[PDB]
Amino acid sequence: MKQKVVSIGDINVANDLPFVLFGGMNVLESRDLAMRICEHYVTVTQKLGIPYVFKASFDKANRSSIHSYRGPGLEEGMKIFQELKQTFGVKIITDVHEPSQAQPVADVVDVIQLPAFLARQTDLVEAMAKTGAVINVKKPQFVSPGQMGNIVDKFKEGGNEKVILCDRGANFGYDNLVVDMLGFSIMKKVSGNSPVIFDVTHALQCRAQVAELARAGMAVGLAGLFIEAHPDPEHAKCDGPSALPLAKLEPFLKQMKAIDDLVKGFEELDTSK
Amino acid sequence: MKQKVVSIGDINVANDLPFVLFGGMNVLESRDLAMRICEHYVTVTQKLGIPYVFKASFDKANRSSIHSYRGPGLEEGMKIFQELKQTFGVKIITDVHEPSQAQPVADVVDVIQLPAFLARQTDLVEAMAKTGAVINVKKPQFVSPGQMGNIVDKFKEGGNEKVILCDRGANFGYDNLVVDMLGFSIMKKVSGNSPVIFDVTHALQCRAQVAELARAGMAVGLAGLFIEAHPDPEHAKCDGPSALPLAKLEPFLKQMKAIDDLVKGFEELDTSK
Amino acid sequence: MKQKVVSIGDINVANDLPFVLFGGMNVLESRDLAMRICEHYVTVTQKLGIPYVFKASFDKANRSSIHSYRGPGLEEGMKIFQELKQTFGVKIITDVHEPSQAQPVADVVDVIQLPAFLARQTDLVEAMAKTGAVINVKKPQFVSPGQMGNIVDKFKEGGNEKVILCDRGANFGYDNLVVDMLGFSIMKKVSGNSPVIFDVTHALQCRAQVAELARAGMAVGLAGLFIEAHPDPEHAKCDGPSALPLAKLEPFLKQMKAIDDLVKGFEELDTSK
Amino acid sequence: MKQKVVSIGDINVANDLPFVLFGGMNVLESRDLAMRICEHYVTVTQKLGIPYVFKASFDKANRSSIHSYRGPGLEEGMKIFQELKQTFGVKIITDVHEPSQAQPVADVVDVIQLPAFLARQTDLVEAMAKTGAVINVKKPQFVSPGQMGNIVDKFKEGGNEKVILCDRGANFGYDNLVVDMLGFSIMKKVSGNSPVIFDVTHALQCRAQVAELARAGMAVGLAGLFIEAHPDPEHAKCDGPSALPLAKLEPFLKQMKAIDDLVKGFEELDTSK
């Protein structure tokens, strides 16, 4: 039962391989903050031997008001990914909402993300399947692990088979997320052993709890980990979804590699019988 | 505490008024089936004294595969609403996905629907607020009743205050919906007493159970009821979301008016103290 | 599909019959308050043509601290049921925890209640099946409607078939209950059409919301309704589980009979096909 | 923030200490199977350097029918714990239902367990607080982590402060459990840093999934792990709650110690700021 590998450049993402980091920041506030954030990742990733794909959003469609911070935009934003790639030479992942945005970005970046709310948007899977780029499918909180067969299948059809699944937790009554550790196996199984990644930040909201959560995730064994940081977490340890104090990256990423390695090399165990 | 009224033509939708029906069919399969479906509504509505707004979808973005039945389309579909309005003289409600579709439809139809998955899509609320049309906001299964303040507020901002809220149940573990009867009061309260409607069909999936559910809903007291029917329910009593056997409309709508009336005229009761 | 009837004296409890009230108070604080509470029920029940079974607890095992108000006790409590029966001539229902309490009470009272937490306690079902009394099984928040087959079956075995099921809601994430209106049909079906009753008070906790909830329940159509009141609801409209302001009984019970009747006589509808 | 330690003989149970195993079997089927089961534990525990407390139930009150296998019984069962202690010299933990059973067992055994369904039974906490024995409180699926303050407090009152908390998952819609990894921190915090243990077997039901689950649990860092095994898992890898194939103990317990150690020694990390 050998794992499907998804390769973002030299980067080999798979559930049996050493874990990839899709770290970064929520939005592209400024380049000035983008570059400083990307700095700490690349330095600490490269030091600690952790494959790295940078992540920031150029657009927002989940603002609370209309006359809020949309963000850079499709046009202004892609230049800031040009200027980061050359300066640091890392792979960039960003979310895409409108179908028309799909091709523009697949050129600029390496991994495109399918936001959870739009996971069941065939108009967007169609148009994002076209690009031929590596897809990150965020697993909707309101969709069960087994239902992720259909979204991978829809991608297959559109031609694109370079797909990652990202668990960002599941609705647990009102205004609460829980992470179903069992979900990861089910998403692997139903996905032709596609790479599963745990979006630990977006699986929190209602902390010190980033740590304990992401360990548990990694101890299952995953292809990668999706995290967001901030130098001063919007002030509160949580910029909307719970952002990690940038400073604490290394001693945290220490803990994750330590588990990912201890776990990834394990006399394959079958409690089945 | 007098209710906010939303008027679709002569039709006055409000939580204290006699209940409006937003009945119809899932997709516009053919006009031949559209018109026959619309027939039974108009005849039974008009007989039974139930304000009526017809509902069918022109587009689908919730297909399971890409090379599936998209449906009529934005262009072919709107003609079939022209040809229904003149022939039957009823108000048409349809869902809208892409932001560009918003203005085209607000002309053709009376009520536009904001699909649950895209409820947190500011690009679409913005563009749908513009039209100035009556909005039906489907309440996401993964969003709590109190959170519906923000979506009504976002609509206010964009200029549009002619907004209905539609409960289509809430995620209850994996692959299961429950309807929180308490939700209706909370959505009223937080919405400036906006009209709340119960999408009974879309709150089912995993029946004979359409009946018992929609009673319970109506006994709370609601502005309206959102239902879909079929002559032969795709064969199974459930065309995706659980469709009502068209024949059983009258003896069912009998039951709903009977509750809506008994309830709507009630020495206002305060169990608060 | 004629309903199983359960007869508490002259009182005929069944899902097709006019609805029975199992109204009352949480604990037997004093007789002085017991009798005053029982007064308002009997007067308003008898006025309004609503079969009535009084309910109060003699014991508590759900106190928050040990050195709290246990309540009257097995010995002191049963005398206060003697003194209520003679004075008012109504049927008394009380909960039972220890297996040894089962026989003592089945003599003193008419209906014994199986508390939710102990629903899966064979030692207690065995001993409560023995009595031959009418059982009220509270449906655990953590047990699904279909699982109520097994508890009715366990009762059958022990000899006792005079069993009512009481829905008191279901766990909905942390520290939250939801009532699944669909549950009532499933509990009927799996229970040999046993009488289902809705414990509206105990299905609330986290109100004005008693009203809207109990309507919805009744509009499904039920054998009965389980409620608790207080003259001054411990001060807050909610003595632990949300207690109804005693004064508002009539104008509330007005609303319930009005639905129970409108519903109970209904050209039986099959949305199944 | 040093951890509260609970000492079962020489055995020191605490969230910072190396993890204790509360392994064993569901019921005492026969001594012949009891002793063979206990054999494999003691051999593999002792080999692998894992503190061990054996667990089996003498009684069952969660049978599906009345005329089912009650089990050994309070009298016949305690002799089989005598005969295991002497032969193997390990600490025995068993569940207790009736209040009268509490003192008898606290003599025979080292750790008594408070079953989840009876966690809110003051009559049993009172009587189990008396014994002065080490308590294992199973955390009800229908009770949230923060609510575990009250049960520890109730134990304090009755005199007994030698209390362990055991997470056995939480209700996740109908007939489904999820384990909230975040729960462990909250139960620690609210419990005066009491020892938290993860009942991995009882957190499954609806497997190969025992493995992935218990890793995740341990990677959080816990005082101990509660598991049940069988030579031939009732035939299916799951004797009611999902039992572990006895043979696979070592290569599984290998994995758990490997995480417990890697985790337990960790430059304490604060993602809080």
Numbering used by the authors:
A (entry chain A), B (entry chain A), C (entry chain A), D (entry chain A): 1 to 206, 218 to 284
How is this structure described in the published paper?
Here, we introduce an approach to reduce sample waste in SFX experiments at the EuXFEL. It is based on the generation of sub-nL crystal suspension droplets embedded in an immiscible oil, allowing injection with a traditional GDVN. We demonstrate droplet generation of 3-deoxy-D-manno-octulosonate 8-phosphate synthase (KDO8PS) crystal suspensions with a microfluidic droplet generator and show that the droplet generation frequency can be controlled by the flow rates of the aqueous and oil streams.
The SFX structure of KDO8PS was solved based on all collected data where droplet formation was confirmed via the in-line droplet detector. The mean of unit cell constant distributions were calculated to be a = b = c = 118.4 Å and α = β = γ = 90° by cell_explorer, part of the CrystFEL package. Detected diffraction peaks reached a resolution of 2.8 Å. Our structure represents the apo protein structure at room temperature, wheras the published structures were determined under cryogenic conditions, where cryo-protectant was added. In the structure presented here, residue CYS-206 showed clear electron density and was therefore included in the model.
